[PDB]
Structures are given as structure tokens and as C-alpha cells.
Amino acid sequence: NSNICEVCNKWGRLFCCDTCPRSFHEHCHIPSVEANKNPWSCIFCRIKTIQERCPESQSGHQESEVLMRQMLPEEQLKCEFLLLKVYCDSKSCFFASEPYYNREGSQGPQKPMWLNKVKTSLNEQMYTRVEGFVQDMRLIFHNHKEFYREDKFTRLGIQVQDIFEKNFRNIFAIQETS
Ligand SMILES: [Zn+2]
Ligand SMILES: [Zn+2]
Ligand SMILES: [Zn+2]
Numbered sequence: 001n002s003n004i005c006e007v008c009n010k011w012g013r014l015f016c017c018d019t020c021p022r023s024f025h026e027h028c029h030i031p032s033v034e035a036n037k038n039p040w041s042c043i044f045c046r047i048k049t050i051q052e053r054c055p056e057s058q059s060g061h062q063e064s065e066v067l068m069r070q071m072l073p074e075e076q077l078k079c080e081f082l083l084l085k086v087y088c089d090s091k092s093c094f095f096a097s098e099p100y101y102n103r104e105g106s107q108g109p110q111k112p113m114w115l116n117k118v119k120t121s122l123n124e125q126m127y128t129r130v131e132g133f134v135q136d137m138r139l140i141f142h143n144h145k146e147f148y149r150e151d152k153f154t155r156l157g158i159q160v161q162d163i164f165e166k167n168f169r170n171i172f173a174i175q176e177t178s
Pocket of ligand 2: 021046
């Protein structure tokens with residue numbers, strides 16, 4: 001196995017995947033690494049198994065159809081993985097915890113959102129459809145863009161949204177277009 005966490009790339013107290021070489025800190029993995037389970041397969045392995053069990057699940061889909069899906073186990077899992085993929089980029093540190101807003105010439109968003117709040121919402125099964133999770137994810141970056149205006153710090157929002165959107169199209173097998 002790897003000697004660093006796959007998500008945050010740091011050493012420490014790591015839990016090792018039994019079906020691939022990846023390793024994780026307890027609360028870096030989503031869901032948090034399970035108490036027992038021998039052997040244990042990580043989220044990457046579990047997502048791979050879904051695809052292998054239903055090869056056709058990789059044929060192209062319409063975003064509109066994906067967003068209306070109910071958060072049954074497999075969609076719950078895919079959303080956990082997509083969130084994990086955002087946390088894997090170091091730039092996610094800017095969006096992880098609860099933000100605050102006091103900048104001259106700007107007003108805070110009406111509905112603040114951050115990655116840890118989405119993490120909790122997923123953990124407590126608060127979303128009934130994929131749409132709920134994707135809306136909150138996109139809100140994080142949209143709140144950022146609006147608040148930071150012409151400061152070049154706005155680009156952090158663009159960069160992390162691009163990671164989200166690429167991984168969304170990949171995980172949910174969205175039909176490729178120009
Ligand atoms: Zn970690
Ligand atoms: Zn694995
Ligand atoms: Zn099948």
C-alpha cells in the first residue's frame with residue numbers, strides 16, 4: 001500500500017485499501033473509514049465495482065436526467081466519491097470550512113455553503129436527489145465568484161469548480177459534447 005493519504009497526500013494514521021494500493025486518513029475517506037470490515041475496499045474500488053457490474057452505466061447520460069435521480073445507495077456513493085475528488089485537490093482548503101464575509105465593497109452571500117457542510121449533509125442523508133448535492137456544490141463556487149468580484153482570488157473558485165465539473169461528468173457518465 002501507499003504510505004501517504006490519497007486525498008491530502010500526508011503521512012499519519014492510515015487505513016489501507018485491501019483491493020487497491022490506496023490509503024486514507026480516517027476522515028479524509030468519505031464515508032469515514034468503517035470500524036471493522038475485513039477486508040475493506042475503499043470508495044475508488046467500490047465505484048469501480050459498480051461500473052464492472054453494469055458496463056452500460058458508462059454510456060452517455062443527460063445531466064438533466066442524472067440530477068433528478070433519487071439518492072439511492074449507488075447515487076449516494078457516487079456523490080460521496082465526487083466530493084472526495086474535490087477534497088483531493090489542495091485548493092479545496094479554501095472551501096472546506098465555514099467562511100465569513102467582511103470585505104469593503106462586497107456583501108456576503110444569502111446562503112453560505114462549504115465542503116464540510118456538504119460532507120455532513122451527505123452523512124446525515126439530507127439530500128433526496130442528486131440535484132440537492134450538485135446545487136450546494138455549485139453554490140460554493142458561485143458564492144465565491146460573486147463575493148470576490150474582480151479580485152484575482154476569484155480564480156480559486158473557477159479552478160476548484162473545474163475540478164468538480166470534470167469529475168461530475170466522469171463519475172456520472174455525462175454525454176460528451178463540444
Ligand atoms: Zn488525508
Ligand atoms: Zn481501493
Ligand atoms: Zn447490468
